[PDB]
Amino acid sequence: GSSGSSGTREKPYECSECGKAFIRNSQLIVHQRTHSGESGPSSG
Ligand SMILES: [Zn+2]
**Cα(21) to centroid(ligand 1), Å:** 8
Its sign, for the CA torsion 5, 10, 14, 20, is negative
Instruction: List the determination method.
Output: NMR
CB 30 within 8 A of CB 15: no
Phi-psi region of 5 (alpha: psi -120 to 50; beta: other; left: phi over 0): left
d(CA 22, CA 30): 10
Whole-number Å distance between alpha carbons of 39 and 43? 9
The answer to whether residues 9 and 21 touch, using CB atoms and an 8 Å cutoff, is yes
What residues does the ion ligand 1 have nearby, CB within 5 Å?
A: 15, 17-18, 20
Domain ranges of the chain: 1-44
